[PDB]
Amino acid sequence: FAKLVRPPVQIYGIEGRYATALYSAASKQNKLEQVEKELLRVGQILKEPKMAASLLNPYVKRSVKVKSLSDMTAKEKFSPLTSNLINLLAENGRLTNTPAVISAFSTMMSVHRGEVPCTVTTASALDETTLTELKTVLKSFLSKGQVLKLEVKIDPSIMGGMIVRIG
């Protein structure tokens, strides 16, 4: 057994169970950002076909997938151990899943713990702070060109039906 690091995000299983591993891995040593970043970099460095979807053939087998993606951490220069967990997604086919696993991981720094608004809100963007919708108040109360095709129009809708909804 081990220390179990459940930092906000956390995929709540669902194949960032590695992420949860790695949240405790990351957290151990706090190579948090490094690896967080490793992962970004990696992220498309992999995710493009470029040797990578070729290597994401099934048909190439971990005979040497273990010897070329893995040895793409070798092929790359990342891997402070970040390949090793690759080599696991490697069997565990999670490579195709990874962005999201990274997402969950990241989000970014304190960004690790974001938030985007909704109900009557129009607004897109994360929240890194403690108490909030101070900032959101001051986020709206920033610009005023603004959208409502970036979220809620309270307009068609909220109460646009309601009177109707009474009759």
């Binding site: 101070l134 005023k144 009759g167």
Partner: protein
Amino acid sequence: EVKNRLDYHISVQNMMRQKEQEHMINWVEKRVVQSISAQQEKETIAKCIADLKLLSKK
């Protein structure tokens, strides 16, 4: 024998009020809803209050 005649007159006035009410409602609401957002500030006036939510809910 009397009562039934009375209930018809009342019942018709009720039924007609609703049958106007929905059509009047749809006709009004389909008319003036077409305006409104030209004043984007039906939008702002609530961002105003919605901000008095964003503040004054927590």
